[PDB]
Amino acid sequence: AINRLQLVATLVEREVMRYTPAGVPIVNCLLSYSGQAMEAARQVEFSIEALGAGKMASVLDRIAPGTVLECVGFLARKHALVFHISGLEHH
Amino acid sequence: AINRLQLVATLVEREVMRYTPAGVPIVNCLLSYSGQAMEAARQVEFSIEALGAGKMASVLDRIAPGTVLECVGFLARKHALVFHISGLEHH
Ligand SMILES: [K+]
Ligand SMILES: [K+]
Ligand SMILES: [K+]
Ligand SMILES: [K+]
Numbered sequence: 001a002i003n004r005l006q007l008v009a010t011l012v013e014r015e016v017m018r019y020t021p022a023g024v025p026i027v028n029c030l031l032s033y034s035g036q037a038m039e040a041a042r043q044v045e046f047s048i049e050a051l052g053a054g055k056m057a058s059v060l061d062r063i064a065p066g067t068v069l070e071c072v073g074f075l076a077r078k079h080a081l082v083f084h085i086s087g088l089e090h091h
Numbered sequence: 092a093i094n095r096l097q098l099v100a101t102l103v104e105r106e107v108m109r110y111t112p113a114g115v116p117i118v119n120c121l122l123s124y125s126g127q128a129m130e131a132a133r134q135v136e137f138s139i140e141a142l143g144a145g146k147m148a149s150v151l152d153r154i155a156p157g158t159v160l161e162c163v164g165f166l167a168r169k170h171a172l173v174f175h176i177s178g179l180e181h182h
Contacts, residue, residue, distance in 0.1 A: 001099040001126030003135060005166070008092040035092030037165045039144050039175055044094060046168040053130050074128045075096070077137040081172070084130055 003074045005083060009033040011067050012047065014060055025057035031069070031083065050083035059088055094165045096174060100124040102158050103138065105151055116148035122160070122174065141174035150179055 014029035028051045037044050050071070052060040063069070072087040105120035119142045128135050141162070143151040154160070163178040 001124065002097050002161075003099075003124055003126060003128060004097045006093050006095045007166075008094075033092065033094055033166075035094060037094060037167070037175065037177075039165075039177060042167075044165065044167050046166065046172060048166070048172065070093075074130075074135065075098075075124075075137065075139070076128070076133075076135050081137060081139065084128065086128075086130060 005071075005073055005075055007031065007033060007048075007071045007083070008035070009048075009069060009071065011060075011063055011065050011069055013065050014063075017057060017061055020053075024054055025061075027052050027057040027060040028082075029060055031071070048083050049078070049080070050085055052085050052088070056085055056088065060085070096162075096164055096166055098122065098124060098139075098162045098174070099126070100139075100160060100162065102151075102154055102156050102160055104156050105154075108148060108152055111144075115145055116152075118143050118148040118151040119173075120151055122162070139174050140169070140171070141176055143176050143179070147176055147179065151176070 009031035012030040070089040073085040100122035103121040123138045161180040164176040
């Protein structure tokens, strides 16, 4: 079953790196989206919690807040929903 | 800025049709997702609020709860986040 989110958003802030019991690094962060959709065009603005695990945690850990990111990933239950980023690029 | 969600999920329930002041029909509903992702494979399960506007409201309004839907759309602020379905198919 497909569960794929593509989102170009601004990194607002990120938490300090933490780890799962297995030692997998995780960086929780907040993304901000601003743009338009098609439903009559509609301006859309919202923020969404996200996180990077493993290599993605390392990647997010070096990105300066305010950077615009082109993200791809999947949605999941926090433990509320959180955006799991599996792919990332600038601009 | 891209904001696109692709989700194959089961329609759990839907509210009665309502309208915006302009007369645009809207059907709010709840979707349930079950499947796997790639982060090491990870089982993922969650429910998410959604809605269809205009023709999409009419389409959802005739779909029986329990039906599996292949959805495409965008995320937005409820007024919390809600999945705006702009495209829909069965299976
Ligand atoms: K999947
Ligand atoms: K911070
Ligand atoms: K867009
Ligand atoms: K109902």
